[model samples]
Target chain A: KRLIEAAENGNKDRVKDLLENGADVNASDSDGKTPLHLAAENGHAKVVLLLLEQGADPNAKDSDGKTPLHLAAENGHAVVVALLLMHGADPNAKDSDGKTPLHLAAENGHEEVVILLLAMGADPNTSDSDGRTPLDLAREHGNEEVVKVLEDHGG
Target chain B: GKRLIEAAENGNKDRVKDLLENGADVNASDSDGKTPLHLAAENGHAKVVLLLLEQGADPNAKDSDGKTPLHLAAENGHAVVVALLLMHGADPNAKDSDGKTPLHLAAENGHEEVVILLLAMGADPNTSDSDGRTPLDLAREHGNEEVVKVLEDHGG
Candidate 1:
C-alpha cells in the first residue's frame, strides 16, 4: 500500500522509507504493475532515479506487458525515458501484443521521445502482430510530426 | 449523500418504497437540486417514478438548471418515464434555464418516442428557445428521421 502510494505521488522521502521498511521494491499491484512502472509512467524523474538506485528492474513489465520504457514513451516523459535509457532499458522490448515503445510513442504523437528512441537504435519499421508499423500507425492517425520522423529515419 | 437518490438511480422499486416508508422525503433534493423522483425518471424506473408520485413527489420539481424529470428522461430517450410524467400532468412545454422545452431536448438528442409524445400533447413545435431554435429546427439540425417526419407532418 505504501509502495503504491509512494510510487504514484513522486514523494522520494516516503518511497525511501517504504523501501527501507522491507517493502519489496519490485512489488506489483492487482494489475501486476510495479512501483517503478508507476514512477516512470507519471514522469517522476527523481522517484524513478531513487527506484533505479535501489535496483528496480528497468525492464519490469506490467499486466499489459508494457515495460516502464513503454509507459514513459507513450506518455511523452522525456526525462524518465532518458533515465531509463541510461540505465540500459531495452529500446525495442515488445509488450504482449508485440508493440514496442516506438509504436506507442508514434501512436500518441510524442515527437521528442520518438526522436530519442529512434536515435537509440529503436526500429521505426518494426511491426506489431497486426502488421501495424510505427510509421503505419503514425500515418493512420495522421500525426504528421511522428510520421515525418519515422520516414526520415528510413522506416 | 443518502440512499434515496442512490436507490432511485438504480431503478429499485421496493428499495425506493422502503426509503419513503422510513420517512425519506419524496421531494428531498441534492445539492444539484435533483430529487429521488428526478433520478427515477432519468434512469427510466417507471415503477419507482409512479411510487414517488403516489408519495407526493412534485412532477414539476425543478433541478439546479430548472430542468424537470421530463427534460432529463427525454434527453436520455426514456420513453416509459416520459409517458408516466405526462400522465401525471407534467408540463410537456415547460421551459428550462436556457428557455428550452422538453420537446427541444428530445428533438436535439433524437429521442423518437419521447418527441412523438410531446408533439402529440400539443407542445408548440415552433416555440424557439434562448438559442432561437424551434423543436423542428433542432430535430432537423440533429437529423432525427422520425422526429423530422413527425414535425414535418405537424406543419414544422
Candidate 2:
C-alpha cells in the first residue's frame, strides 16, 4: 500500500527502494489501477520505468477499462508510452468507451503521440459507440494536424 | 342603400319585399366588394341568402379576392349557408385569385364539418394552387390531424 502511494506520488527514489525491499510491484488500488498505471498517468517517467522493471503489468486496466498505455497516451506522456510499448503493452486496448490509445491521442490533439501510435501499428479506423472513428473525432474537435496525420496513416 | 343592404343581408321577408318594391338592386356591392348576400352567407344568414337567390343575385359573384358567397360560407364552417348555396347551384370548385377553392379554405382552416358537407356535395379535394400545394398539404402543414384524416378518407 505504501509502495502504491509512493508510485502514485511519483516519488521515484521511494518506489525504487520499495521494489528493492521486495514490495509487490503489481499491487493494485481499489479501482485496479496498478502502480505502473498511476506512474505513467501522473507523467512520472522514471517511476514508470522503475515499476515496469520491477515486473508491474503495463496492461492492467482500472475500473474504467483504461490500461496504463491508454493513460500515458491520454496525457501525452511520450516517453512513458514508448516504454510501455517496448514492454509489449497492447496498443489496441480499448477503454469502456471503446476508445483505443490512438483515439485518446487524437481526441487530445496530441500530434506527436498520434503519429507515434500510428507508427507503432495502432489501428486508425477504430470507432466509438457513436460510430466516430479517431479521424472523425479529430475532425470534430478541429485538430487539423492530428487529422492530417490520421488521414496520412490510412484513417 | 344601407337599408336595402340590411334587408337583403337579414333576408327579412317583409323588409326585402318592401326594399325590392322600392327598387333595391339585390346584387348591389358593398364597400368591400361583397354583396348583401355575401355578408348574409358569410354570417350564416340562411334566410337572407335565400331571399337574395330569389332576387336573382348571381351566386357566383366574387368579392375582391374572387371569393364567392359560397366560398365565404364554406370556409366559415356555416353548414346551413353552404347547403343553401349548393341548392342555389353555386360552383363548388370556383377558386379565388389565390387559386384556393372553398374546399381548400375549409381544409386549411380545419373546418371538418364544412369539408364533409362540401365533399358530399361533390367538391374536388385534389385541386392545387399556383404554389402546387394541395388541400392535404395545407392540412398537414397546419397540423390539423383530424382534417388530414378526413381529407385522406375522402381521397384528398
Candidate 3:
C-alpha cells in the first residue's frame, strides 16, 4: 500500500526505497489498482519506470480489469504508454466492459498516445462489449486528431 | 437573448411566430454561434424547429461545439425535433467536439426512442468516435436495451 501511495504521489525516491526494502511491487489497492496503475494514471513516469524495472507485473489488473496500460492511455500519458508497451504490456488488454486500452485512450482525446498506440501495433478495429471501435470513441469524443490517425491506419 | 431566440428556446411556438413576424432574423446567431433553430432543437421544441426551418433557417447549422441541431435534439432525446431536423436534411452523421454523431449521443444518453428514429432515418450504426465506439457500443455500455435491440436489428 505504501508503494501504491508513493507511486501515486510521484515520490520516486520513497517508492525506490520501498522497493529496495522488498515491498510488494505488484500489490493492489482497495480497487485492485496497482502501483503501476496509479503511477501511470497520475503521469508519474519515473515511478512507473522504477516499478516496471523491479519486476512489477506490467499487466496486473484492477477491480475493473484495467491494467497500467489502460490507466496510462486513458490519462493521455504517452511516455507511460510507451514504457509499459516496451516492457511487453499487452497493447490490446480489455477491461471488464470489454473495452480495450485503445478505447480508453481515444475516448479521452490523447492524440500523441493514440498515435503511438496505433504505431505500436494496437489493433485499430477492435470495439467494446458493443460494436464500437477506437475510431468510434475518438470520433464521438470529437478527437479529430485521434480520428485522423485511425483513418490513416485503415479508413 | 433576443425575443426570437428567447421564444424559440422557451418552446413558445406562438411567440416565436410573432417574433419572426416582427422581423427576427431566422438565421441570426448569438454569441456562442447558436441559431434560433439550434435553441429550438436543443430544448425539444418541435413546432419551433419546424417553424424556424420553414423560415429559411439553415437546417445543418452548427453551434460553437460543432453540434448540429440533430446533435442537440438527439442528446436531449427529442424525437420530434430529431425527426424534424432529419426531414429538413440534417446530417445525422455530423461530428461534435468528441466526434459524437447524433446516433452516438442518443445511444450514449439512453435515448431509445431517438435512437430508433435516427436508425430508421438511415444513420450509420457502426460509425465510430475517435476511440472507435459505435452507437451500438454506447447503447450496450449505457444499458439502453431498447436502443441495443434497434441498433442490432439495423445491423450496428
Candidate 4:
C-alpha cells in the first residue's frame, strides 16, 4: 500500500492522511516489516516519530526478529534510534542472529548510534549466536572508531 | 521514469518481456546510463538477460562507472549470467572507470567459476587496474586461494 512507500520515502503528509483514513500504523508488509521498520532503516526520522506517536510498536520484531531499533542502528540512523528508544524499544533487543542494536551499529561503524545505544543501556559485552561481542565485530571489520568506543565502554 | 529498469533489476522476466513487447526501449538507459541488460545481468536474471539480448540490447553498454553488464555479473558471482553475456558476445576483459577488468572483480570477490570463464574468454591475467594491481595481486590480497591458484595456472 501507499503507507509503506510514504513511510519509507519520508512522505509525512501521505502517512498522516493514511493513518487518519484507517490504515494500520503497525501493519507489516510481505516482509513482516512495519512502517516504523521501513522509516527507521531508511533514516526517515520524521516518519519514525509519527509512526511511534500513532502507536506503532517500537520494539516490534520483523520476520527476521529485527526491531526498528536494530534497523535504525544498523543504518546509522542516530535520530531514529533515539526516537525508538524514547518510545520504549528494547535497548538490548536481539535479532534472529542474537545481534543487538549495539552489535549492528558497531559492526557498520555507526559511531554516533553506537554511543547512543550504549548510553541507553545496551549491553557492551553481549555476544551474538557466534559468541562474538560488539568489540570483536568492530575489530574484525576494521572499524577503528567503533573499536575505540567499545573499548572505552570496557567491552 | 524508468519502470523497465526496475523490472529488469528485480529480475521480473515477464514484466520485462511485457514492457519490451509493448514498444519500450530495449536499450533505454537509466540516469546512470545502466541499460536493462546491465540490471538483468547484475541481478542474475537469466531469462531477462536472454530476452534483452534477443531484443537487441547492447551487451557492451557501459554505465556511469564505465562498467558493462559482464563486470557487474562477474562481481556478484552470477556464473550463469556471466556465461550468458559471454555467449552473446560480452567482452570478458571489459574495464570499468577504475580500469579494473571483469577478471579483476571476479578475482577480488573469489568467484572461481566466473574467473575461470573470464580467463577462458580471453581475459588478460596480467591486466593491472588503475591501482597497478593485477588480478592475481587482488586474489592474493583478499585471501582467495582458489582464485589465485586458477590465475597462477593461467600465467597471471
Q: DockQ of every model listed?
A: 0.01, 0.00, 0.01, 0.01
Ranking by TM-score: 4, 3, 1, 2
Error of 2 at B115 (Å): 88
**After superposition, which runs of candidate 3 have C-alpha atoms over 4 Å from their true positions?**
B1-156
What lDDT does candidate 3 reach at residue A112?
A: 62
Q: lDDT per residue, candidate 3, B1-156, as tens digits?
A: 377888898988778878878887899888888988998889987656766886798878888898888999999998656766775678888988888899999999998667765665568999989888899999899788868876775678
lDDT string for model 4 (A7-54, tens) is 988887799899999999989888888888999999886677668878
**Candidate 2 wrong stretches, greater than 4 Å:** B1-156
DockQ of 3: 0.01
Tens digits of per-residue lDDT, candidate 2, B1-156, equal 577677666656467658777888888887778888788888776556666776787788899989999889888887556755765678888999989888888888888756755665578889997688888998899888878976776678
Q: TM-score for each prediction?
A: 0.49, 0.49, 0.49, 0.50
lDDT of 3 at B46: 63
Steric clash pairs (candidate 2): B11-B48
TM-score of chain B taken alone, candidate 1: 0.95
Minimal lDDT window, size 10, model 2 chain B: B8-17
What does candidate 1's lDDT look like per residue over B1-156, in tens digits? 379999999987778878877988888889999998889889887667767776788889999999999899888887656766765678988999998999999999988667765664567888889989998889889778768876765567
Clashes of 1: 0
